[PDB]
Design an enzyme around this catalytic site. Sequence first.
Site, PDB file in Angstrom:
ATOM      1  N   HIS A  45       9.746 -10.112   6.824  1.00 41.22           N
ATOM      2  CA  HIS A  45       8.785 -11.138   6.424  1.00 41.22           C
ATOM      3  C   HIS A  45       9.252 -11.965   5.227  1.00 41.22           C
ATOM      4  CE1 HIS A  45       6.733  -8.406   3.396  1.00 41.22           C
ATOM      5  NE2 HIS A  45       6.641  -9.576   2.782  1.00 41.22           N
ATOM      6  N   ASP A  93       9.420  -4.495  10.211  1.00 37.70           N
ATOM      7  CA  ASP A  93       9.549  -5.388   9.050  1.00 37.70           C
ATOM      8  C   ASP A  93      10.832  -5.077   8.280  1.00 37.70           C
ATOM      9  OD1 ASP A  93       9.122  -7.411   7.250  1.00 37.70           O
ATOM     10  OD2 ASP A  93       7.337  -6.484   6.322  1.00 37.70           O
ATOM     11  N   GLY A 186       5.977  -9.900  -4.238  1.00 36.66           N
ATOM     12  CA  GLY A 186       7.286 -10.033  -4.880  1.00 36.66           C
ATOM     13  C   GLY A 186       8.098  -8.746  -4.911  1.00 36.66           C
ATOM     14  N   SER A 188       7.976  -6.876  -2.095  1.00 36.54           N
ATOM     15  CA  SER A 188       8.304  -6.805  -0.670  1.00 36.54           C
ATOM     16  C   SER A 188       9.794  -6.890  -0.454  1.00 36.54           C
ATOM     17  CB  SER A 188       7.690  -7.983   0.071  1.00 36.54           C
ATOM     18  OG  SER A 188       6.306  -7.766   0.307  1.00 36.54           O
ATOM     19  N   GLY A 189      10.294  -6.102   0.498  1.00 37.72           N
ATOM     20  CA  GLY A 189      11.732  -6.098   0.807  1.00 37.72           C
ATOM     21  C   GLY A 189      12.532  -5.120  -0.034  1.00 37.72           C
TER      22      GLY A 189
HETATM   23  C1  LIG Z   1       5.317  -8.137  -0.551  1.00 39.80           C
HETATM   24  O1  LIG Z   1       5.541  -8.359  -1.679  1.00 39.80           O
HETATM   25  C2  LIG Z   1       3.860  -7.878  -0.215  1.00 39.80           C
HETATM   26  O2  LIG Z   1       3.424  -8.298   1.024  1.00 39.80           O
HETATM   27  C3  LIG Z   1       2.792  -8.201  -1.179  1.00 39.80           C
HETATM   28  N1  LIG Z   1       1.498  -8.290  -0.581  1.00 39.80           N
HETATM   29  C4  LIG Z   1       0.459  -8.455  -1.441  1.00 39.80           C
HETATM   30  O3  LIG Z   1       0.642  -8.471  -2.584  1.00 39.80           O
HETATM   31  N2  LIG Z   1      -0.769  -8.639  -0.991  1.00 39.80           N
HETATM   32  C5  LIG Z   1      -2.020  -8.508  -1.754  1.00 39.80           C
HETATM   33  C6  LIG Z   1      -2.662  -9.824  -2.156  1.00 39.80           C
HETATM   34  C7  LIG Z   1      -3.887  -9.840  -2.829  1.00 39.80           C
HETATM   35  C8  LIG Z   1      -4.457 -11.040  -3.183  1.00 39.80           C
HETATM   36  C9  LIG Z   1      -3.853 -12.223  -2.869  1.00 39.80           C
HETATM   37  C10 LIG Z   1      -2.629 -12.249  -2.218  1.00 39.80           C
HETATM   38  C11 LIG Z   1      -2.032 -11.019  -1.873  1.00 39.80           C
END
Ligand SMILES: *C(=O)[C@H](O)CNC(=O)NCc1ccccc1
Length: 240
Positions: A45, A93, A186, A188-189
């Site tokens: 992603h 993913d 941030g 993620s990965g």
């Molecule tokens: C990769 O870094 C991840 O997918 C991070 N996902 C999130 O942080 N999601 C939670 C979130 C809460 C409120 C607004 C946007 C994202």
Amino acid sequence: VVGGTEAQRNSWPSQISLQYRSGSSWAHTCGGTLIRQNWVMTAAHCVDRELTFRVVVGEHNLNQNDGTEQYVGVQKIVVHPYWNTDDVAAGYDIALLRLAQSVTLNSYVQLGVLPRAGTILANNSPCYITGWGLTRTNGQLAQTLQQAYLPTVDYAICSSSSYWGSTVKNSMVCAGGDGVRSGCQGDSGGPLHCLVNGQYAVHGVTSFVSRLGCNVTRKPTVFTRVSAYISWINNVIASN
Ligand SMILES: *C(=O)[C@H](O)CNC(=O)NCc1ccccc1
Ligand code: NA
């Protein structure tokens, strides 16, 4: 990382910063794990967008000269062929990035150790998430690499109704869920590092957290289970 502490400069030398070009500058978007001198493992992603990406190895502070960084372009992106952007819950993913140059290894830049294929961690196994992701839900990126202690939550518990239910698959690892510490946007990965037989290995690639927030009780951070993808990884590296 919510509820993290600053990592020592040389604790997690396989951690990378995946960045995209934004005007005249570069912006951190995701983590990754260096797995060969010219290959990085990250989340599919993280690379859905048609951006120009680079990898930074030996990175500690996104906003200051560490004196240890190497910056390298991404030459080829191989996403898992079953990945579907509108269905993160399906899994898959994971992506491999072939770097334009082979990086030089040192105390700040090392290959991540991957688990043996099929390895499943016992419930409550000791792990750390690392990354420069948001330090609070809807907050901002960390400047310095953060770590948080996130013990695993096994499939049985993680896929139970009060946790993630059907959303979590056996191809994933859950960790944390204490309502205090978590991955966040941030991260993620990036890696989940777990201590097994005295050695840390990268068991997870950070994939998702709750839409409700990062550090939500009984919504542990969810990672792609690296040990489910060993043959796929080896196949990609061997054919590329
Ligand atoms: C990769 O870094 C991840 O997918 C991070 N996902 C999130 O942080 N999601 C939670 C979130 C809460 C409120 C607004 C946007 C994202
Ligand atoms: Na830096």
